[PDB]
C-alpha cells in the first residue's frame, strides 16, 4: 500500500518530475530501463517479471518537453500512453488551458489516473507538479484539481509549485494566470507548497556556490526536497510523516494550506568537508531567511506550524535539543494560539547524491515546511501587480476570447483579497 | 580692479547656473544603460 500519484502539468512539471524519476530511481537502485539488477511500491508498480513502472502523469499541450522524456534515457521506464500529449501550447492563457484547448484532453488524463489509481490499494494522495505562471500549469492544473476533487474527494491532494518571483520573473501575462489559479487552489487543494525560482537562484549561488545554475539544479533540489517528503512512505524510521497527518499537523485553517518548503543541508562539495553538519545547525539553517525556498522574509512573519523532516543519520534527542533552542530565540515568533508548533519525523535513509549532482554527500538532511503568515507579503505584490496590469485591462481581451468573463478577474481578485484578510486575522494575537 | 572682479565673479556665477539648468534637464530621464546583477545583501536573523 502507502501508494501515491504523481501529476506532471506543463513544462515546469514536467522537468521536476524528470528530476523527481531520476532521484527515485537512484534511490530505490531501478535502473532507467525499469529493472533492478519492498519500498518502491509507493511510487513504483510492478509489470510481470523485473519492470517498475513510475505511478506518474505526464500532461501537456505541447509535445516538445514530452518528446524529451519519450527520446532521453528514461523512455523505457514510463509506458508510452502514460505520457499525455496535446496539439497546441495553452500559450501563457490561462483561458486555453482552461476553457478551450485543455477540454479535448481531461477526459485522456482522468481515465489515465483512474486506471492508474485502480492497481493501487492503498491511494492516499496525488502530488500534482505545476506552476503559477504558465497558461496549462495554471488552467489546466486548475481543471485537474477540480475534477479529482468531485471525483475522488476523502484523497489527499498534495500540490508543489513554483510561484512567480517577487523581481526577476520570465513572463507578461504572469500576475494574471496565477491569481487566476490561486481561486481554485483556496479550495480544490489540501496542501499547496510553494516553491520561487528566484530563492533558488539565491540559493545555488550563496550555499552551492554555482555562477551560472540552469533549470536542472532548480528541479534538482525540488526533487530533493520532494523525496524528503515522501521518505516515510519510501522508508522506515523512528517517526514516520505519512502525508495525512503531515496535511492534518501542519494546516490549522481550512484555507491556509500553503507552507513554505525549505531544505538544509544544501552545500558544495569542498565545503562540506569543514562544516560539523551537526542536527542543531540544520535545524538552525532551516530557520535563516537567506535559506527560504520562496522570496518573503519570515521575520515579518510569525509561525504557525513547522514540520521538520529528518533524515540520515539523526536521533531524537538532538531534534528536542533544537527545537528547544529555536523556542528560546526571540527572532523567530510563533502565534500565541500554538503552544506546540512543530511535527517531526526521523527517517533512516540519508538523501542520495544524484550523479553529476552539485549536492555534497551529507549524514544528516531536514526538509521543513512552515506555514508561516509571511506569504502575505509575496501575495500582495501579485496583488499590486495583477492591479497595475488590470486597471487598463491590459491583456484581458487575451482571455475573453478563448471563454473568460471580467466576472472572473473580479472574483478571483475579491477572494484572493479575502484569503489576505484572512491571513491578517489569524496572524494577529489574543 | 574691482569692476574686473565684480564681472568675473558675475560670469563664473552664470556659468554655474547654466551648468545646473542643464544638469536638471539632463537627470530627468537618465540614458539607457544595462550591465551585471549587484545581488542583494542576504538578511540574517538579528
Ligand atoms: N523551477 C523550474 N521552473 C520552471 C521550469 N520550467 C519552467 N518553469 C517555470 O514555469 C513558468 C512558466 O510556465 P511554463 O512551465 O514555462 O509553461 P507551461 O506550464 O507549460 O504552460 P504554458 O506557458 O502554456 O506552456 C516560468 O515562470 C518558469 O519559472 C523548470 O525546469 N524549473
Ligand atoms: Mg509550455
Known amino acids: ?430 | 580692479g574691482d569692476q574686473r572682479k565684480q564681472m568675473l565673479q558675475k560670469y563664473k556665477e552664470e556659468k554655474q547656473l547654466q551648468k545646473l539648468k542643464e544638469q536638471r534637464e539632463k537627470a530627468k530621464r537618465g540614458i539607457f544603460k544595462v550591465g551585471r546583477y549587484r545581488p542583494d545583501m542576504p538578511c540574517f536573523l538579528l
Open chain 1, 1 to 430: 500500500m502507502r501508494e501515491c500519484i504523481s501529476i506532471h502539468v506543463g513544462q515546469a512539471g514536467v522537468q521536476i518530475g524528470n528530476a523527481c524519476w531520476e532521484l527515485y530511481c537512484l534511490e530505490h537502485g531501478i535502473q532507467p530501463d525499469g529493472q533492478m539488477p519492498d519500498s518502491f511500491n509507493t511510487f513504483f508498480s510492478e509489470t510481470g517479471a523485473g519492470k517498475h513502472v513510475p505511478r506518474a502523469v505526464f500532461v501537456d499541450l505541447e509535445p516538445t518537453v514530452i518528446d524529451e522524456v519519450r527520446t532521453g534515457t528514461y523512455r523505457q521506464l514510463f509506458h508510452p500512453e502514460q505520457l499525455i500529449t496535446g496539439k497546441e501550447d495553452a500559450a501563457n492563457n490561462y483561458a486555453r488551458g482552461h476553457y478551450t484547448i485543455g477540454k479535448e484532453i481531461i477526459d485522456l488524463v482522468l481515465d489515465r489516473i483512474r486506471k492508474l489509481a485502480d492497481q493501487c490499494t492503498g491511494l492516499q494522495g496525488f502530488l500534482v507538479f505545476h506552476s503559477f505562471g504558465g497558461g496549462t500549469g495554471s488552467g489546466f492544473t486548475s481543471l485537474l484539481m477540480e475534477r479529482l476533487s468531485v471525483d475522488y474527494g476523502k484523497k489527499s491532494k498534495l500540490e508543489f509549485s513554483i510561484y512567480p518571483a517577487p523581481q526577476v520573473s520570465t513572463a507578461v501575462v504572469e500576475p494574471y494566470n496565477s491569481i487566476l489559479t490561486t481561486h481554485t487552489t483556496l479550495e480544490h487543494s489540501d496542501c499547496a507548497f510553494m516553491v520561487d525560482n528566484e530563492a533558488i537562484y539565491d540559493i545555488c549561488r550563496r550555499n552551492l556556490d554555482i555562477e551560472r545554475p540552469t533549470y536542472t539544479n532548480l528541479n534538482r533540489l525540488i526533487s530533493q526536497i520532494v523525496s524528503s517528503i515522501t521518505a516515510s512512505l519510501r522508508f522506515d524510521g523512528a517517526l514516520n510523516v505519512d502525508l495525512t497527518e503531515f496535511q492534518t499537523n501542519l494546516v490549522p485553517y481550512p484555507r491556509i494550506h500553503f507552507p513554505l518548503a525549505t531544505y538544509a543541508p544544501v552545500i558544495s562539495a569542498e565545503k562540506a568537508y569543514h562544516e560539523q553538519l551537526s542536527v542543531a545547525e540544520i535545524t538552525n539553517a532551516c530557520f535563516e531567511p537567506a535559506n527560504q525556498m520562496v522570496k518573503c522574509d519570515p521575520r515579518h512573519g510569525k509561525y504557525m506550524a513547522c514540520c521538520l523532516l529528518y533524515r540520515g543519520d539523526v536521533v531524537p534527542k538532538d531534534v528536542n535539543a533544537a527545537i528547544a533552542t529555536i523556542k528560546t530565540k526571540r527572532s523567530i515568533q510563533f502565534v500565541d494560539w500554538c503552544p506546540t508548533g512543530f511535527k517531526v519525523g526521523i527517517n533512516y535513509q540519508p538523501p542520495t547524491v544524484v550523479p553529476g549532482g552539485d549536492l555534497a554527500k551529507v549524514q544528516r538532511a531536514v526538509c521543513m515546511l512552515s506555514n508561516t503568515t509571511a506569504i502575505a507579503e509575496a501575495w500582495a505584490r501579485l496583488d499590486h501587480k495583477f492591479d497595475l496590469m488590470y486597471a487598463k485591462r491590459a491583456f484581458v481581451h487575451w482571455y475573453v476570447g478563448e471563454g473568460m468573463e471580467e466576472g472572473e478577474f473580479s472574483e478571483a481578485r475579491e477572494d484572493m483579497a479575502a484569503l489576505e484578510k484572512d491571513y491578517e486575522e489569524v496572524g494577529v494575537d489574543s
